[PDB]
Design a protein around this nucleic acid. Structure first.
Lengths: 109, 108
DNA sequence: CAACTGATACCGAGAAACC
DNA sequence: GGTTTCTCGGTATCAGTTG
């Protein structure tokens, strides 16, 4: 019934979203971009693409029918990451105060 | 069946918001509020979930710890899973203060 | 006031569980 | 064979903070 682990793994492996990059060869720690939507370094298309992808994969957002709202997509992906036991962030490696802000996550068996 | 239990609950008039929509006593409203933290009293009908927990013995008053959330869970699942109740989803009102959803009892 | 956030409440859909 | 309750994997809100 789980659909987040495989989806995220395929998303990183696709190499489609810049920033979504494996940090080791063992496929168990990965970086995920995390930029504020209000800042000037923010690009609506690139930085909000993964959250929108998760939103429309699970069928929450339907392009053309629903009014878009990237903040809620970000919150969906965030809450799914905190809640699911398959991912846990390494908060010491997650630098959220640089020109690029990212988050480091680690996968369990 | 919870059909007769809930019919008696609406008929009792004890629960605010638990009221029939018609004279035939077939369609009714049930309040549906989101709780706070320990704030389960904003829910106009938390006593209904308490009463369901007491009826099936899922909570012994003074012997078990109160858990309003799973009481509400139990009530909602038993409602939408029962063939005796159909939701009038085109009538339910979750977007308003004093929020409620409308159900219809079916004879069989 | 947008955007964001951890913690808690919530939800549907089976899978037991019970009568 | 027929009515509820238990699990699970996420989702949405509570009650705020950040910028």
């Amino acid at each position: 019934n789980g659909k987040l682990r495989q989806w995220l793994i395929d998303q990183i492996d696709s190499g489609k979203y810049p920033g979504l990059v494996w940090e080791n060869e063992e496929k168990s720690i990965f970086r995920i971009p995390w930029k504020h939507a209000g800042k000037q370094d923010y690009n609506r298309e690139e930085d909000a693409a993964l959250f929108k992808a998760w939103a429309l994969f699970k069928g929450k957002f339907r392009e053309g029918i629903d009014k878009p709202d990237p903040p809620t997509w970000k919150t969906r992906l965030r809450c799914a990451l905190n809640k699911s036991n398959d991912f846990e962030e390494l908060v010491e490696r997650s630098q959220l105060d640089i020109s690029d802000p990212y988050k480091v996550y680690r996968i369990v068996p």
